[PDB]
Amino acid sequence: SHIDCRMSPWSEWSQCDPCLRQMFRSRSIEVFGQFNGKRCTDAVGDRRQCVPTEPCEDAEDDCGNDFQCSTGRCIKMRLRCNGDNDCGDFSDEDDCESEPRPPCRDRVVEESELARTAGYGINILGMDPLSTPFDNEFYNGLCNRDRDGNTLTYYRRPWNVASLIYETKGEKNFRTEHYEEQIEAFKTYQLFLSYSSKKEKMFLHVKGEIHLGRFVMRNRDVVLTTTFVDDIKALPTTYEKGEYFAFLETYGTHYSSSGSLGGLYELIYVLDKASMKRKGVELAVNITSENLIDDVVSLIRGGTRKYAFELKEKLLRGTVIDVTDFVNWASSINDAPVLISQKLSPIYNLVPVKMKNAHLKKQNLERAIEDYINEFSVRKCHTCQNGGTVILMDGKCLCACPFKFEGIACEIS
Amino acid sequence: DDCGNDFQCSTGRCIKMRLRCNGDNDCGDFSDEDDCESEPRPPCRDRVVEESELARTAGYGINILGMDPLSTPFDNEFYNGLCNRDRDGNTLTYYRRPWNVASLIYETKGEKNFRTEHYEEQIEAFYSSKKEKMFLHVKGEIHLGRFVMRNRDVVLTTTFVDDIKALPTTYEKGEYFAFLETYGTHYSSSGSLGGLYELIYVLDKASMKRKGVELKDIKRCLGCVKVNITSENLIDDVVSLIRGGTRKYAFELKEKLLRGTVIDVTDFVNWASSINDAPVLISQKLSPIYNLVPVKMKNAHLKKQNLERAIEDYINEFS
Ligand SMILES: *[C@@H]1O[C@H](CO)[C@@H](O)[C@H](O)[C@H]1NC(C)=O
Ligand SMILES: *[C@@H]1O[C@H](CO)[C@@H](O)[C@H](O)[C@H]1NC(C)=O
Ligand SMILES: *[C@@H]1O[C@H](CO)[C@@H](O)[C@H](O)[C@@H]1O
Ligand SMILES: [Ca+2]
Ligand SMILES: [Ca+2]
């Protein structure tokens, strides 16, 4: 029969966290739902208000002679007045009635529209990008002007983006592979048998990888977003799974410590086709089968709307593609890049030392991320039949099979 | 309630003192922005930005058992006085991100498929058996951007928390079902803005293929001499599902299909250009709405526990 969402009992509640003015509760997921039963939508934990059972400790975490900004954030005095968006929000106008001097002197430099997005959060579940933990509109008083980028225009590189180098690389891989076959035979009162069979196989693989450089994030002196540091300040300090999962679900299990920008296209045709016949009379019989799979798939990512969706389908069809259609799509990757692949750093590496209780939060995050990877596992689900495998999705385990066996568990043929 | 040193709001909210003067509608109908005209200090230092129409509707309510208002309990007019921004690579326009939405990533990611599997078998002796299974699929995705939204520090519409302050402490099933349809049964904590199609050909190929068309020719005519297939009555049984875009281009694609004719590649790109106006959600990750009920609510855990007792009854209220 079909399969429903299931969970443990809830655990015993927390004490009241005196400065956070809340209490916390949590529960384990045990079945997601499957085979089109009752799909999960169900939470890992819950929180309740309390008048706290003890005093809160002194909140302020002041860095000293550094300027304490209107954000959660400290900054060094060379950046108190710098003609720039220092310290994570504008916080300076009442001081900077003098000393306007910019990082870039007499110049007109623009922001790198790639570097602002560098250091995506990533969730290891599905490997979706999330907006940066990193500030990337902070420049540390450095001008650090790059003339780089294929559109021959200068930009200012933001402090956390240690490298952004436009290594252009364009690759195409193409493979075709056919094997094609036929076998046939033949052999008052009379006898005969006639036999024939034919097989056709094609595998095409194509991929085109187009780079727009690579970013490497800085491994010391990282300046983080006001929202992220605040979302680390507002933590239980006691390993409440559901509350830590709420931070993973807004900034990722990892961040891309370095990532490769650009675009990709990929195409497959697989065709695998067979027909078999026998006929005979012996002093009538006539016995046949046909088996075909035909599956063509196209992926395009990166570039602008028009060119990508043109090229996506032109390439899927029989069409002999115009080189200038490729040039347009591949040029538009300048305007609209996508993250091709990247190196992942566990997110707790961005819990800054020189914040209160930092190392306790890190060991909690390290445990919590391990739990977040465990109770979302596929290994708990019931088995697929025949040649399929257990796919995982939010609130369902399932399988599907382009192989003449059928249903949401591939059980029938 | 009192907001301490910060400002108390009409229809019930607390706005941090630095927000009030900024231009950002912090307390609804610009009622934050009674006189501060000596210090009207903006969130953005004269930088050009236009508000994100895709994301202003993000965080739609959804119900498995009689569909929800497709509307936001979240207040996507709120920005915490930040200027943080995501931009359209297609028109090179910057948008502010509503502070509910933890991430916008505009990601041009088209995918497409065409597929058939077919089996036939016959055994005959003048025991016997005969079998068919056949289909043709065309499937497509158009993807405009990911959204993901907060699980804490959420700022709701005042009209949503009002609809919690009006709930009784008791289970009151009729009133709790009124709320659970007034805003939603569940919310997408994340989703995928775009458009989608599925155009299954229920046509068994032999229905035409006994007349002068080959398998490679009918595939050629779909995406041809050997008959005039576009003139002929022969193509009939094609389904249409089509999600998002401007109704003209959705109609043109449907009209061509119900006429038994192929859509031109010109058409699909025209449709894909129009998903910028009128997006739909291709997939969603779901949580029940009680997770939005603020921890400050005067019987908060009791109301949330009764919303769980109410959500549980919808599954029995319908077959
Ligand atoms: C028998 O022969 C006919 C004529 O070629 C063929 O169409 C059919 O598939 C064969 N199989 C049967 C009738 O079992
Ligand atoms: C096939 O018939 C249609 C009318 O249904 C006609 O417009 C078309 O010209 C014929 N063949 C061609 C040229 O497509
Ligand atoms: C944990 O589950 C218990 C059921 O034993 C409830 O009382 C509570 O609301 C929480 O969900
Ligand atoms: Ca300054
Ligand atoms: Ca305001």
- A129: tokens are 């990008």
CA distance A368 to A387: 35
CA B229 to ligand 2: nearest atom: 1
CA A305 from centroid of its chain's CA atoms: 20
Opening angle at CA A262, ends A257 and A268, nearest 5: 115
For residue A201, which of A227, A176, A226 has the smallest C-alpha distance? A176
Instruction: Name the β-bridge partners of A205.
Output: A175, A268
Distance A96 CA to ligand 4 centre (A): 7
Measure the CA–CA gap between A375 and A43, rounded to whole angstroms.
12
User: Which two tokens mark A351?
Assistant: 């819990």
List the single residue in B117, B220, B273 with the smallest CB-CB distance to A292. Answer: B117
Give the technique used to solve this structure. cryo-EM
**A80 Cβ contact partners less than 8 Å away, ≥ 6 residues apart:** A67, A86, A92, A95, A96
* Chain-centre distance for alpha carbon A213: 19
According to DSSP H, which parts of chain B are helical?
Answer: 53-56, 158-165, 173-182, 206-209, 215-222, 247-258, 265-274, 300-317
Partners of B142 in beta bridges: B195
In degrees, to the nearest 5, what angle opens at C-alpha A366 toward C-alphas A365 and A371?
90
Q: Write out chain A residues lying below 8 Å of B102, CB-based.
A: 130-131, 250-251
Rounded CA separation B229/B227 (Å): 6
How does DSSP assign B219-236, residue by residue? Answer: HHHH------TTTSS---
Which burial class, exposed, middle or buried, applies to A310 when counting CB atoms under 10 A from its CB (0-12, 13-18, 19+)?
Answer: buried
Interval between CA A17 and ligand 3 midpoint (Å):
21
Pairing of strands A110-111, A155-156: parallel
B305 CB less than 6 Å from ligand 3? yes
Q: Which ligand is nearest to the CA of A100?
A: 4
β-bridge pairing A145-146 and B186-198: unpaired
Q: Which atom, in ligand 2's list, is nearest to the CA of B228?
A: 1
Task: Give the other-Cβ count within 10 Å of A100's Cβ.
Answer: 9
**Which is the closest atom of ligand 3 to the Cα of B305?**
9
SS (H, E, C) B264-289: CHHHHHHHHHHCCCCCEEEEEEEEEH
Which contacts qualify for A23-29: CB closer than 8 Å, 24 or more apart?
A: A23/A47, A23/A48, A23/A49, A23/A50, A24/A48, A24/A236, A24/A238, A24/A240, A24/A242, A24/A243, A25/A242, A26/A240, A26/A241, A26/A242, A27/A242, A28/A375, A29/A5, A29/A375, A29/A376
Stated in angstroms to one decimal place, the resolution of this structure is 3.3
Rounded distance between C-alpha atoms, residue A239 and residue B149, angstroms:
23
Q: Under an 8 A CB cutoff, do A295 and B106 touch?
A: no
Q: What is the distance between the alpha carbons of residues A297 and B113, in angstroms, rounded to a whole number?
A: 4
Q: Which residue's structure tokens are 């990008």?
A: A129
Q: Is A90 in the pocket of ligand 3 (CB under 6 A)?
A: no
Integer CA distances (angstroms), A71 to A118, A235, A236, in order = 22, 18, 21
Phi first, then psi, for residue A213 (nearest 5°) are: 85, -170
- Please classify residue B210 by burial: count the beta carbons closer than 10 Å to its beta carbon, then call 0-12 exposed, 13-18 middle and 19+ buried: exposed
Tokens 């108190």, residue?
A80
Residue A196 contacts residue A208 (beta carbons within 8 Å): no
Q: Hey, which bits of A27-104 come out as E strands? A: 29-34, 45-49, 67-68, 74-75
Spatial separation of the C-alpha atoms in residues A7 and A45, rounded to whole Å: 11
Q: Which amino acid is at B161?
A: V
Comparing alpha-carbon positions, the chain A residue that sits nearest to B19 is: A70
3 state DSSP class of A53: coil
